[PDB]
Design an enzyme around this catalytic site. Structure first.
Site, PDB file in Angstrom:
ATOM      1  N   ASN A  44       0.850  -1.198   0.000  1.00 58.42           N
ATOM      2  CA  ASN A  44       0.000   0.000   0.000  1.00 58.42           C
ATOM      3  C   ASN A  44       0.883   1.243   0.000  1.00 58.42           C
ATOM      4  O   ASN A  44       1.857   1.337   0.767  1.00 58.42           O
ATOM      5  CB  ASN A  44      -0.914  -0.057   1.206  1.00 58.42           C
ATOM      6  CG  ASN A  44      -1.916   1.068   1.329  1.00 58.42           C
ATOM      7  OD1 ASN A  44      -2.166   1.563   2.432  1.00 58.42           O
ATOM      8  ND2 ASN A  44      -2.510   1.514   0.229  1.00 58.42           N
ATOM      9  N   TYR A  77      -7.345  13.975  -2.119  1.00 60.63           N
ATOM     10  CA  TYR A  77      -7.054  13.200  -0.917  1.00 60.63           C
ATOM     11  C   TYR A  77      -6.476  14.120   0.121  1.00 60.63           C
ATOM     12  O   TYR A  77      -5.632  14.944  -0.228  1.00 60.63           O
ATOM     13  CB  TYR A  77      -6.065  12.073  -1.294  1.00 60.63           C
ATOM     14  CG  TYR A  77      -5.474  11.366  -0.098  1.00 60.63           C
ATOM     15  CD1 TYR A  77      -6.187  10.382   0.580  1.00 60.63           C
ATOM     16  CD2 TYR A  77      -4.200  11.717   0.341  1.00 60.63           C
ATOM     17  CE1 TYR A  77      -5.611   9.754   1.684  1.00 60.63           C
ATOM     18  CE2 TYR A  77      -3.632  11.091   1.440  1.00 60.63           C
ATOM     19  CZ  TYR A  77      -4.344  10.113   2.106  1.00 60.63           C
ATOM     20  OH  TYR A  77      -3.780   9.485   3.205  1.00 60.63           O
ATOM     21  N   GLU A  86      -9.451  11.218   7.308  1.00 59.18           N
ATOM     22  CA  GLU A  86      -8.771  10.984   6.037  1.00 59.18           C
ATOM     23  C   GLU A  86      -9.852  11.024   4.969  1.00 59.18           C
ATOM     24  O   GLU A  86     -10.815  10.248   5.097  1.00 59.18           O
ATOM     25  CB  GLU A  86      -8.032   9.643   6.028  1.00 59.18           C
ATOM     26  CG  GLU A  86      -7.215   9.378   4.751  1.00 59.18           C
ATOM     27  CD  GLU A  86      -6.503   8.032   4.821  1.00 59.18           C
ATOM     28  OE1 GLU A  86      -7.147   7.103   5.381  1.00 59.18           O
ATOM     29  OE2 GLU A  86      -5.353   7.924   4.332  1.00 59.18           O
ATOM     30  N   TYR A  88     -11.411  11.382   0.788  1.00 56.85           N
ATOM     31  CA  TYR A  88     -11.109  11.057  -0.588  1.00 56.85           C
ATOM     32  C   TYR A  88     -12.263  11.516  -1.492  1.00 56.85           C
ATOM     33  O   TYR A  88     -13.402  11.195  -1.181  1.00 56.85           O
ATOM     34  CB  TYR A  88     -10.984   9.570  -0.848  1.00 56.85           C
ATOM     35  CG  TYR A  88      -9.926   8.729  -0.205  1.00 56.85           C
ATOM     36  CD1 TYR A  88      -9.949   8.434   1.158  1.00 56.85           C
ATOM     37  CD2 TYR A  88      -8.920   8.204  -0.997  1.00 56.85           C
ATOM     38  CE1 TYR A  88      -8.935   7.632   1.668  1.00 56.85           C
ATOM     39  CE2 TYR A  88      -7.918   7.410  -0.492  1.00 56.85           C
ATOM     40  CZ  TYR A  88      -7.940   7.137   0.864  1.00 56.85           C
ATOM     41  OH  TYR A  88      -6.949   6.335   1.387  1.00 56.85           O
ATOM     42  N   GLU A 177      -3.003   6.223  -5.218  1.00 59.92           N
ATOM     43  CA  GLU A 177      -2.860   5.199  -4.210  1.00 59.92           C
ATOM     44  C   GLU A 177      -2.871   3.837  -4.893  1.00 59.92           C
ATOM     45  O   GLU A 177      -3.649   3.586  -5.812  1.00 59.92           O
ATOM     46  CB  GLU A 177      -3.978   5.274  -3.163  1.00 59.92           C
ATOM     47  CG  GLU A 177      -3.918   4.181  -2.119  1.00 59.92           C
ATOM     48  CD  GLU A 177      -4.676   4.485  -0.844  1.00 59.92           C
ATOM     49  OE1 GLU A 177      -5.296   5.563  -0.714  1.00 59.92           O
ATOM     50  OE2 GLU A 177      -4.628   3.622   0.059  1.00 59.92           O
TER      51      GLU A 177
HETATM   52  O1  LIG Z   1      -8.275   3.946   2.410  1.00 59.65           O
HETATM   53  C1  LIG Z   1      -7.530   2.806   1.941  1.00 59.65           C
HETATM   54  C2  LIG Z   1      -8.445   1.592   1.979  1.00 59.65           C
HETATM   55  O2  LIG Z   1      -9.359   1.663   0.860  1.00 59.65           O
HETATM   56  C3  LIG Z   1      -7.622   0.313   1.805  1.00 59.65           C
HETATM   57  O3  LIG Z   1      -8.466  -0.824   2.038  1.00 59.65           O
HETATM   58  C4  LIG Z   1      -8.077  -1.980   1.328  1.00 59.65           C
HETATM   59  C5  LIG Z   1      -8.698  -1.945  -0.141  1.00 59.65           C
HETATM   60  O4  LIG Z   1      -8.374  -3.203  -0.752  1.00 59.65           O
HETATM   61  C6  LIG Z   1      -9.052  -4.323  -0.074  1.00 59.65           C
HETATM   62  O5  LIG Z   1      -8.627  -5.496  -0.800  1.00 59.65           O
HETATM   63  C7  LIG Z   1      -9.368  -5.835  -1.939  1.00 59.65           C
HETATM   64  C8  LIG Z   1     -10.474  -6.941  -1.591  1.00 59.65           C
HETATM   65  O6  LIG Z   1     -11.183  -7.197  -2.812  1.00 59.65           O
HETATM   66  C9  LIG Z   1     -10.322  -7.787  -3.846  1.00 59.65           C
HETATM   67  O7  LIG Z   1      -9.943  -9.072  -3.369  1.00 59.65           O
HETATM   68  C10 LIG Z   1      -9.135  -6.909  -4.188  1.00 59.65           C
HETATM   69  O8  LIG Z   1      -8.291  -7.601  -5.115  1.00 59.65           O
HETATM   70  C11 LIG Z   1      -8.342  -6.539  -2.934  1.00 59.65           C
HETATM   71  O9  LIG Z   1      -7.344  -5.564  -3.278  1.00 59.65           O
HETATM   72  C12 LIG Z   1      -8.567  -4.448   1.370  1.00 59.65           C
HETATM   73  O10 LIG Z   1      -9.334  -5.506   1.967  1.00 59.65           O
HETATM   74  C13 LIG Z   1      -8.813  -3.148   2.128  1.00 59.65           C
HETATM   75  O11 LIG Z   1      -8.171  -3.179   3.418  1.00 59.65           O
HETATM   76  O12 LIG Z   1      -6.599   0.171   2.859  1.00 59.65           O
HETATM   77  C14 LIG Z   1      -5.611   1.203   2.713  1.00 59.65           C
HETATM   78  C15 LIG Z   1      -6.308   2.616   2.932  1.00 59.65           C
HETATM   79  O13 LIG Z   1      -5.404   3.635   2.557  1.00 59.65           O
HETATM   80  C1  LIG Z   2      -0.824   7.639   5.608  1.00 60.27           C
HETATM   81  O1  LIG Z   2      -0.674   7.649   7.086  1.00 60.27           O
HETATM   82  C2  LIG Z   2       0.645   8.034   7.477  1.00 60.27           C
HETATM   83  C3  LIG Z   2       0.863   9.548   7.008  1.00 60.27           C
HETATM   84  O2  LIG Z   2       2.259   9.811   7.038  1.00 60.27           O
HETATM   85  C4  LIG Z   2       2.816   9.906   8.354  1.00 60.27           C
HETATM   86  O3  LIG Z   2       2.439  11.259   8.806  1.00 60.27           O
HETATM   87  C5  LIG Z   2       2.836  11.485  10.171  1.00 60.27           C
HETATM   88  C6  LIG Z   2       4.431  11.447  10.212  1.00 60.27           C
HETATM   89  O4  LIG Z   2       4.865  11.523  11.547  1.00 60.27           O
HETATM   90  C7  LIG Z   2       4.899  10.003   9.715  1.00 60.27           C
HETATM   91  O5  LIG Z   2       6.339  10.004   9.660  1.00 60.27           O
HETATM   92  C8  LIG Z   2       4.340   9.754   8.310  1.00 60.27           C
HETATM   93  O6  LIG Z   2       4.668   8.406   7.907  1.00 60.27           O
HETATM   94  C9  LIG Z   2       0.577   9.675   5.446  1.00 60.27           C
HETATM   95  O7  LIG Z   2       0.512  11.096   5.198  1.00 60.27           O
HETATM   96  C10 LIG Z   2      -0.808   9.101   5.113  1.00 60.27           C
HETATM   97  O8  LIG Z   2      -0.956   9.132   3.680  1.00 60.27           O
END
Ligand SMILES: O[C@@H]1[C@@H](O)[C@H](O[C@@H]2CO[C@@H](O[C@@H]3CO[C@H](O)[C@H](O)[C@H]3O)[C@H](O)[C@H]2O)OC[C@H]1O
Ligand SMILES: *[C@@H]1OC[C@@H](O[C@@H]2OC[C@@H](O)[C@H](O)[C@H]2O)[C@H](O)[C@H]1O
Ligand SMILES: [Ca+2]
Length: 190
Positions: A44, A77, A86, A88, A177
């Site tokens: 991620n 974002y 957070e 989006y 992302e």
């Molecule tokens: O905000 C972000 C979240 O959206 C992110 O959540 C993950 C999104 O992906 C899911 O996995 C999918 C499940 O469905 C299929 O199997 C796909 O191939 C997979 O990618 C995860 O379950 C969620 O956790 O997490 C990060 C956050 O920044």
């Molecule tokens: C995801 O969550 C982590 C965020 O980055 C952190 O921000 C706080 C800092 O102290 C730390 O070092 C960073 O990793 C990032 O902005 C988000 O996208």
């Protein structure tokens, strides 16, 4: 240039690049508001350019190439504090809709498409203030695109109506992302 995870300013724009340490991601800052991300077998990550801090009435323009292969988002974002949120405004995604599993709270029409609105929660996850539990707000565009203008007020105002309130803004970017996938993107923000 190609850089490691972090934040800072380039060519008059804030940038933020974050990853989970998996590897397989290359983040690069370009001229002006441009950044690129190329990834292959990643974990991620989230990276992009914009503003620190954001505002609740910014009109944000983006244009470029967005070529995910798998789970990835292209969004306006950013974060707020007090409350810690957070958020989006998703303009494009790859194979996985980030609202899958989330309860729909309403709709907003903006910039040529309807968007569906959802709240989710992240539990004990990384954040702009370190490990935390916090809500996320989503506007998910029904008709995807990789260039356009986003009037964020339309989204923030609709969220607010739905009880989704934002605190004091922290950063606000156009971010790519990825979630355990591959792809290439090159986006210019203004
Ligand atoms: O905000 C972000 C979240 O959206 C992110 O959540 C993950 C999104 O992906 C899911 O996995 C999918 C499940 O469905 C299929 O199997 C796909 O191939 C997979 O990618 C995860 O379950 C969620 O956790 O997490 C990060 C956050 O920044
Ligand atoms: C995801 O969550 C982590 C965020 O980055 C952190 O921000 C706080 C800092 O102290 C730390 O070092 C960073 O990793 C990032 O902005 C988000 O996208
Ligand atoms: Ca798509």
């Amino acid at each position: 240039q190609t850089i490691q995870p972090g934040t800072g300013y380039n060519n008059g724009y804030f940038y933020s690049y974050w990853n989970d340490g998996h590897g397989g991601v290359t983040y690069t800052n370009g001229p002006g508001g441009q950044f690129s991300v190329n990834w292959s077998n990643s974990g991620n990550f989230v990276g992009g350019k914009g503003w620190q801090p954001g505002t609740k009435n910014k009109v944000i323009n983006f244009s470029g190439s967005y070529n995910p292969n798998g789970n990835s988002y292209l969004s306006v974002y950013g974060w707020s504090r007090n409350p810690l949120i957070e958020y989006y405004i998703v303009e494009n995604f790859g194979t996985y809709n980030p609202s899958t599993g989330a309860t729909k709270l309403g709709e907003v029409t903006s910039d040529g498409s309807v968007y569906d609105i959802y709240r989710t929660q992240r539990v004990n996850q990384p954040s702009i203030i370190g490990t935390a539990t916090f809500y996320q707000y989503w506007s998910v565009r029904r008709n995807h695109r990789s260039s356009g203008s986003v009037n964020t007020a339309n989204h923030f105002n609709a969220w607010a109506q739905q009880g989704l309130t934002l605190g004091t803004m922290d950063y606000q970017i156009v971010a790519v992302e990825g979630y355990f996938s591959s792809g290439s993107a090159s986006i210019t923000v203004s």
